[PDB]
Amino acid sequence: AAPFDKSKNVAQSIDQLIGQTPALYLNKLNNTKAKVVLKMECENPMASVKDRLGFAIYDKAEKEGKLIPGKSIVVESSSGNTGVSLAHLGAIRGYKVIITMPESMSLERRCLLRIFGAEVILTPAALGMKGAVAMAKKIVAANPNAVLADQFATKYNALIHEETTGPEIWEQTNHNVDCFIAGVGTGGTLTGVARALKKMGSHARIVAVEPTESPVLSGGKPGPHKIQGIGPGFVPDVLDRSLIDEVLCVAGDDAIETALKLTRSDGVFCGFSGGANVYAALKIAERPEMEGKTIVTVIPSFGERYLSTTLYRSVRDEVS
Amino acid sequence: AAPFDKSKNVAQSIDQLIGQTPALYLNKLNNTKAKVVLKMECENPMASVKDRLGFAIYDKAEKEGKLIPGKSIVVESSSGNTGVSLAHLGAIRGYKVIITMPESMSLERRCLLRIFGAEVILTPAALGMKGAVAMAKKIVAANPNAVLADQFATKYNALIHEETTGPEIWEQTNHNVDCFIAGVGTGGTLTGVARALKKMGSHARIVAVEPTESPVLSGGKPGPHKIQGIGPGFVPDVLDRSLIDEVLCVAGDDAIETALKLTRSDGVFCGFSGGANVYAALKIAERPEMEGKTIVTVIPSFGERYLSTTLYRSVRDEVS
Ligand SMILES: [Cl-]
Ligand SMILES: [Cl-]
Ligand code: NA
Ligand code: NA
């Protein structure tokens, strides 16, 4: 992952286009005295931050001798972006990929993976995401060539963000970050950017966002919620809590409202978690102590993947 | 549009992220003795090459005094990417946008525009795209503040590709292009890149692609076809035919097959026209005279916009 000016050279493979994403000031929606900078992970080649984790898993596991193309089978339970990035990169790298997900998932979630030739294993609807996780573990337990991508525990996750996401942010902001805010899914983005920032001498406050309706890091009970991509309902092993200065809860409805406003104000088109992250950033930006300071957050995924979800239903309903 | 390393700076607005897109060698799908380079326009912020035309229209028309935010109303007939890019940029720039399209268009085509607050005017299904074009002209004729985006005639279209797309290609290929191939929609991409290449001293052969089922440039009759984004059924005023060395017809089914293969071979995920363009590139690449030469083509738009179209139906059917 050495820097590589995409705008001046021809890549030998699409995985060289992952990361080195743009950064963008929040402008019309930012009515505060603080700068808000959006790390545009929606601009990755398969349109989300999980492209960095997918690449890290194939790249680093192959380099360590743990994956062998044409022999290893990569397995994961995912109804979201990790599955997509695994299916995408697995195809070009010559791995069989198996993704498990409940039978009740939308046609779009299943069809996107099958485009890249992943095998999708549908689990009983009534068993929910737990039934998909169980099926993935059983597959890996039974077959010696089948390995779990292990997104919530893998050491590669925080590392890739430490090596790439965080240093890009550091360069883009000209070494000036007063607060870094990110919703925690696997915790990789938050943990790895916080490590890089700290090694650089930054005093940035590190803020983890989680859904108000599943406030686990806050000491509450796990619960179903709307903010796809964060709030896994347990504390993931990837996450290093020691680095977090503040856990901020954002309600699913504030995330949804914010995503809808962002498209029309700033032309940023994203999913629920980018709505939650910007809502959190604007909330921090309002605090009088943040006057003149620079807050960085992340836009994790591009909006087009959500057109069929509850995120844009208010527009769907209006359109009908 | 001066060069601006997105990977090292923070943009003040999302329209600074348009253009300066990556380029990528075709690898597993390329079994020839020629290099094939893909200009990745699917990596634009709203996921297609029309982001460059949208920006050119607002930017240049405002600079010339022809558009005034909050006064001018931008109007276009589009069931595709031009509407999206106009709706996107109009929102952030403070223009009312009206897009006309037949009533029979998918929920996704209508809902995407309404996300950016464009007004969508649905025209009678039986009148087809002609009825949408007529409604746009009538709106512009009747209202002095309403102006047509005029995608098929506007002088801004070839110009933006001459000023940006073509010079990026020239830098990325280290001033070495033996053939440039592009499907003609408005003709802007082909015309403007061919001009830039010629001004640079390139001897590249310029190849226009059109659908076999609507072979208008070839002297045939217009007809309905599958390859969304090209083959408008007339010769657009933007297109300068004098620059074209060869018109190559590609069948809709070859475009569809090629798009499906590209995802699994090279991880390139695009629409029908990127399928057609790569099919054409591989066809040229097979000619014995092209041994060791570099062919450039374009991937116009990202695949996610097509999940609901006939492009991926073979996977949709398999998934069901
Ligand atoms: Cl998101
Ligand atoms: Cl395309
Ligand atoms: Na992309
Ligand atoms: Na994008």
Side-chain angles (χ1 to χ4, degrees):
Chain A
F4 168 80
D5 202 333
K6 282 182 297 196
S7 72
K8 314 284 180 210
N9 302 278
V10 181
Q12 306 251 55
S13 53
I14 197 162
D15 62 39
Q16 299 181 273
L17 305 187
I18 294 178
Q20 303 184 292
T21 53
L24 171 67
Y25 285 116
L26 187 67
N27 173 23
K28 177 161 152 211
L29 206 68
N30 185 7
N31 57 354
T32 76
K33 301 173 288 213
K35 301 305 182 187
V36 176
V37 168
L38 309 176
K39 181 57 163 163
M40 300 287 285
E41 295 296 309
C42 51
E43 311 299 291
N44 279 109
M46 200 40 54
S48 86
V49 63
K50 289 315 200 307
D51 285 5
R52 293 187 192 249
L53 171 64
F55 183 68
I57 292 174
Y58 292 109
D59 186 58
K60 303 174 180 316
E62 292 183 58
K63 284 182 196 160
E64 280 160 31
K66 308 170 172 145
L67 284 173
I68 308 192
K71 195 184 180 194
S72 304
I73 302 168
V74 178
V75 178
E76 198 44 291
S77 58
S78 185
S79 301
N81 291 326
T82 297
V84 174
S85 292
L86 296 172
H88 173 54
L89 292 173
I92 62 158
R93 281 173 176 264
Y95 298 91
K96 190 189 183 172
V97 177
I98 299 174
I99 307 294
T100 61
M101 65 172 77
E103 203 173 5
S104 51
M105 283 313 99
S106 75
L107 164 72
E108 288 87 11
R109 296 283 181 279
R110 300 184 304 277
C111 175
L112 190 49
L113 304 186
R114 193 56 184 142
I115 291 169
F116 301 106
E119 167 172 24
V120 177
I121 298 295
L122 297 176
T123 57
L127 305 177
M129 284 303 159
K130 292 188 166 170
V133 165
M135 180 58 64
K137 290 170 166 177
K138 160 70 186 178
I139 289 162
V140 165
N143 190 341
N145 295 140
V147 299
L148 203 69
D150 204 9
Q151 61 176 322
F152 291 107
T154 181
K155 55 177 179 157
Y156 302 138
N157 187 344
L159 177 65
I160 191 69
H161 284 110
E162 184 172 2
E163 295 181 319
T164 59
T165 319
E168 301 164 13
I169 281 165
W170 190 242
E171 172 65 17
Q172 284 162 319
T173 57
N174 191 22
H175 301 194
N176 188 34
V177 182
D178 302 302
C179 170
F180 179 69
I181 304 169
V184 166
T186 66
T189 301
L190 195 73
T191 302
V193 169
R195 293 182 169 153
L197 280 175
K198 282 178 188 313
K199 277 194 204 165
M200 299 291 105
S202 181
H203 288 294
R205 300 285 159 250
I206 304 304
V207 179
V209 164
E210 67 184 354
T212 296
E213 301 73 24
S214 191
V216 169
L217 288 175
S218 295
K221 298 300 202 67
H225 68 91
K226 291 182 197 171
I227 311 181
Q228 177 176 329
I230 71 173
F234 49 85
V235 182
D237 293 340
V238 162
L239 179 77
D240 189 348
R241 291 187 84 114
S242 64
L243 304 177
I244 297 175
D245 294 284
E246 176 178 6
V247 176
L248 186 159
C249 301
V250 183
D253 290 343
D254 290 324
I256 288 170
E257 297 179 357
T258 299
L260 299 170
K261 291 168 174 161
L262 265 168
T263 61
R264 299 172 183 187
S265 64
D266 289 73
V268 176
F269 181 37
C270 64
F272 296 90
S273 80
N277 278 355
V278 161
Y279 184 89
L282 282 173
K283 180 146 147 192
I284 306 223
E286 278 166 2
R287 291 167 181 179
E289 67 268 21
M290 292 314 287
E291 190 172 343
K293 300 303 191 184
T294 290
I295 292 151
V296 178
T297 191
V298 178
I299 300 298
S301 69
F302 187 63
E304 200 146 10
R305 196 157 296 162
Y306 301 89
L307 282 176
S308 79
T309 76
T310 66
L311 188 53
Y312 287 112
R313 176 71 175 260
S314 66
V315 187
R316 206 165 111 192
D317 286 346
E318 203 217 310
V319 160
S320 311
Chain B
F4 168 80
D5 202 333
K6 282 182 297 196
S7 72
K8 314 284 180 210
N9 302 278
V10 181
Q12 306 251 55
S13 53
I14 197 162
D15 62 39
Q16 299 181 273
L17 305 187
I18 294 178
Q20 303 184 292
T21 53
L24 171 67
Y25 285 116
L26 187 67
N27 173 23
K28 177 161 152 211
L29 206 68
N30 185 7
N31 57 354
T32 76
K33 301 173 288 213
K35 301 305 182 187
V36 176
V37 168
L38 309 176
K39 181 57 163 163
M40 300 287 285
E41 295 296 309
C42 51
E43 311 299 291
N44 279 109
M46 200 40 54
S48 86
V49 63
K50 289 315 200 307
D51 285 5
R52 293 187 192 249
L53 171 64
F55 183 68
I57 292 174
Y58 292 109
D59 186 58
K60 303 174 180 316
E62 292 183 58
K63 284 182 196 160
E64 280 160 31
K66 308 170 172 145
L67 284 173
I68 308 192
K71 195 184 180 194
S72 304
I73 302 168
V74 178
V75 178
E76 198 44 291
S77 58
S78 185
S79 301
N81 291 326
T82 297
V84 174
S85 292
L86 296 172
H88 173 54
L89 292 173
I92 62 158
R93 281 173 176 264
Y95 298 91
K96 190 189 183 172
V97 177
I98 299 174
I99 307 294
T100 61
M101 65 172 77
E103 203 173 5
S104 51
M105 283 313 99
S106 75
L107 164 72
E108 288 87 11
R109 296 283 181 279
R110 300 184 304 277
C111 175
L112 190 49
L113 304 186
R114 193 56 184 142
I115 291 169
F116 301 106
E119 167 172 24
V120 177
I121 298 295
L122 297 176
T123 57
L127 305 177
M129 284 303 159
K130 292 188 166 170
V133 165
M135 180 58 64
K137 290 170 166 177
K138 160 70 186 178
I139 289 162
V140 165
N143 190 341
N145 295 140
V147 299
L148 203 69
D150 204 9
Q151 61 176 322
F152 291 107
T154 181
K155 55 177 179 157
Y156 302 138
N157 187 344
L159 177 65
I160 191 69
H161 284 110
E162 184 172 2
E163 295 181 319
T164 59
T165 319
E168 301 164 13
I169 281 165
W170 190 242
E171 172 65 17
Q172 284 162 319
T173 57
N174 191 22
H175 301 194
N176 188 34
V177 182
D178 302 302
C179 170
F180 179 69
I181 304 169
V184 166
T186 66
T189 301
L190 195 73
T191 302
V193 169
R195 293 182 169 153
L197 280 175
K198 282 178 188 313
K199 277 194 204 165
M200 299 291 105
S202 181
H203 288 295
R205 300 285 159 250
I206 304 304
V207 179
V209 164
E210 67 184 354
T212 296
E213 301 73 24
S214 191
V216 169
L217 288 175
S218 295
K221 298 300 202 67
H225 68 91
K226 291 182 197 171
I227 311 181
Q228 177 176 329
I230 71 173
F234 49 85
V235 182
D237 293 340
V238 162
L239 179 77
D240 189 348
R241 291 187 84 114
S242 64
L243 304 177
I244 297 175
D245 294 284
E246 176 178 6
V247 176
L248 186 159
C249 301
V250 183
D253 290 343
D254 290 324
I256 288 170
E257 297 179 357
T258 299
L260 299 170
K261 291 168 174 161
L262 265 168
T263 61
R264 299 172 183 187
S265 64
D266 289 73
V268 176
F269 181 37
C270 64
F272 296 90
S273 80
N277 278 355
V278 161
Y279 184 89
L282 282 173
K283 180 146 147 192
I284 306 223
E286 278 166 2
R287 291 167 181 179
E289 67 268 21
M290 292 314 287
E291 190 172 343
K293 300 303 191 184
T294 290
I295 292 151
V296 178
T297 191
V298 178
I299 300 298
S301 69
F302 187 63
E304 200 146 10
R305 196 157 296 162
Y306 301 89
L307 282 176
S308 79
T309 76
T310 66
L311 188 53
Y312 287 112
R313 176 71 175 260
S314 66
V315 187
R316 206 165 111 192
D317 286 346
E318 203 217 310
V319 160
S320 311

